[PDB]
Write a protein that binds this ligand. Structure first.
Ligand SMILES: NC(=O)c1ccc[n+]([C@@H]2O[C@H](COP(=O)([O-])OP(=O)(O)OC[C@H]3O[C@@H](n4cnc5c(N)ncnc54)[C@H](O)[C@@H]3O)[C@@H](O)[C@H]2O)c1
Ligand SMILES: NC(=O)c1ccc[n+]([C@@H]2O[C@H](COP(=O)([O-])OP(=O)(O)OC[C@H]3O[C@@H](n4cnc5c(N)ncnc54)[C@H](O)[C@@H]3O)[C@@H](O)[C@H]2O)c1
Lengths: 336, 336
């Protein structure tokens, strides 16, 4: 049971609001779309099909009522263009900002474009929302902002030095968010995601994330590469926690805003152990090389989510095993 | 005597290099131009006449040899456009990045534009320079990055929270500079200026800085406004120190790079005392209301320059009194 969360969703189903999801055709944004439409919300969506997909929107349309779908106004556009940002704010209540170019290697090779989308694009949305005078503003931040801090698990007040352009942009989101509270009194909630996985995470690409990259390879029968000695660990977080954490935040009490919160489960799984779980779970539906680490790669990563639990009444109900199990079917359909 | 500085300038007069000054029509940039051309350097200049002036370039042309001037290639352009940034890097040895929109109030009202120039513009130049593989890279940072830290004087390792969009952009310059060291091995030197004053500082404008704002008013005979109880203090720094600090840095030894340095004198003058010195010095060439503080205004400000003195052999030779005295004549000519 996710109790506060249940309570919040009930409220919404009755007094429906207008939401704006940027990066709505992406993995996390499309997940949020699914959930919000099922709660009969009015949604305005923004994506520029950089890393997002029209097919992700399509799939969502097959998962929801057609009266539910009628409430979605999709917009093909760029958060990089301030004018778009403003047209799309009209009448919005809650903002869920997910639009950004992710990935550490990507920023390392083209920082200019990453900067433009993640900082210029972020500030645009943030400003537009301030002026539109929305009721809440929740944005995607990154566990990467911890950088070289050696503490495990990671606690929000203690970050170190950023180790890549990507980490910087995300840190810069937070800093801007704070200054906006100081100078306009406009209160946000930033979520430091930690390695989210689940349905509709792109397994194709040079920047494919690990769980969907391995899963696709274990099916095609291709090699499975482990970038390093295979001891690196992470706090893998199923989408349903992230979806939960977004809603808790959009409707959070004012004293909880202007805050940064880790979004994860509190556990730690190794690149070796993961390969275990991904296989065990895939052969229950009937179907390993080593290399160097990456430049900018992180050694150990585990979150402390007590802040979330405390102030927002968060409930990480789905740990990694179950999460993989709820996921693999989606990748079979998608990979046939 | 400025001994290491003297030593450096001799070297240059012999093995002249190609320099790039952004914000070269501005106050600090035009001052750097004057100095570099007098040392027979080759200078490529970039400004977009946002806050800079063609007349500032003109004045410089009357202060220097015409063989000296022939070595200046001026370019009307924007650091916001990456392509410009690259054409201008061709063959450059030392970069002196001064192009930015200054002022705390200005960022508070239009953060989007401030963001674009100070971060996007900064990143462009920094990237361009990395690829061009220059020999040095020195950029204008801000004492504002101390934010809400209560220590006096201020010491580079200890900063607090930024209190305005402006402060954020400048802080973000530093962070980027560092990450560039980590990830490409490209070593910079950031200078945290502290309230620079001297010849060619625009006394006109809503955002005019204090010393030229008061000086122009004391001549026109207008009122002189003191934003607050007139106890606020600052470390006023004459340009010749900042000019000195830029050169020390461009030619600094590699172990001194990837560092941030305060640029100031170490002293502290009050808004009440300043009004004293500006008058005493102006009536020796023959010619007060109170209001509220500013939002984002700072209470006390004094730098610790020992790091500069240690690692770069800096010498703050000109304190405030003398500096005002060297300045007032320029404002008479300019204000007739
Ligand atoms: N996935 C993670 O582990 C993780 C970690 C930290 C932060 N985040 C943030 O989560 C958010 C979503 O991540 P994701 O994995 O779902 O990524 P994703 O690429 O799947 O989703 C990104 C979406 O961004 C949109 N987009 C990108 N740039 C845009 C622009 N300029 N204008 C309009 N739309 C644009 C596209 O429609 C795309 O669908 C991103 O902010 C990501 O940085 C994710
Ligand atoms: N003047 C000071 O006391 C002080 C204090 C702190 C920091 N600084 C920093 O020092 C640098 C110069 O200071 P200043 O007082 O001479 O300011 P300034 O206004 O005199 O100089 C700014 C110059 O940059 C140019 N510029 C602005 N945006 C540009 C763009 N997008 N592309 C190209 N050129 C652009 C302007 O035309 C102007 O010539 C700035 O980065 C400023 O932030 C100055």
């Amino acid at each position: 049971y996710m109790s506060r969360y249940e309570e919040i969703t009930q409220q919404l189903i009755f007094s429906p609001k207008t939401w704006l999801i940027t990066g709505v055709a992406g993995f996390i944004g499309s997940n949020l779309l699914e959930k919000l439409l099922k709660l009969n919300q009015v949604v305005i969506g923004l994506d520029n099909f950089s890393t997002g997909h029209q097919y992700n929107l399509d799939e969502v349309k097959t998962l929801v009522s057609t009266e539910q779908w009628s409430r979605f106004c999709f917009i093909e556009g760029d958060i990089r263009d301030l004018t778009t940002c403003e047209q799309v704010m009209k009448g919005v209540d809650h903002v869920l900002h997910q639009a950004a170019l992710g990935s550490v290697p990507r920023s390392i090779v083209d920082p200019i474009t990453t900067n433009a989308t993640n900082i210029t694009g972020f500030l645009n949305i943030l400003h537009a929302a301030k002026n539109a005078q929305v009721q809440s503003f929740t944005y995607a931040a990154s566990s990467s902002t911890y950088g070289d801090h050696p503490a495990l698990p990671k606690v929000e007040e203690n970050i170190g030095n950023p180790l890549s352009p990507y980490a910087v942009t995300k840190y810069v989101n937070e800093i801007y968010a704070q200054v906006y509270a100081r100078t306009y009194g406009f209160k946000t909630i930033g979520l430091r995601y930690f390695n989210v996985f689940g349905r509709r995470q792109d397994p194709n690409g040079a920047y494919a994330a690990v769980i969907p990259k391995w899963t696709a390879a274990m099916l095609k029968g291709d090699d499975v590469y482990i970038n390093g000695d295979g001891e690196t660990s992470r706090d893998f977080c199923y989408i349903d926690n992230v979806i939960q954490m977004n809603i808790l935040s959009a409707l959070a009490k004012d004293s909880a805003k202007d805050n940064i919160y880790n979004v994860a489960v509190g556990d730690r799984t190794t690149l070796n152990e993961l390969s275990g779980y991904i296989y065990d779970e895939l052969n229950l539906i009937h179907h390993i090389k080593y290399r160097e680490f990456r430049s900018g790669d992180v050694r150990h990563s585990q979150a402390d989510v007590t802040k979330a639990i405390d102030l927002l009444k968060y409930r990480p109900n789905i740990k990694i095993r179950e999460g993989l199990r709820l996921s693999m079917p989606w990748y079979v359909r998608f990979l046939k």
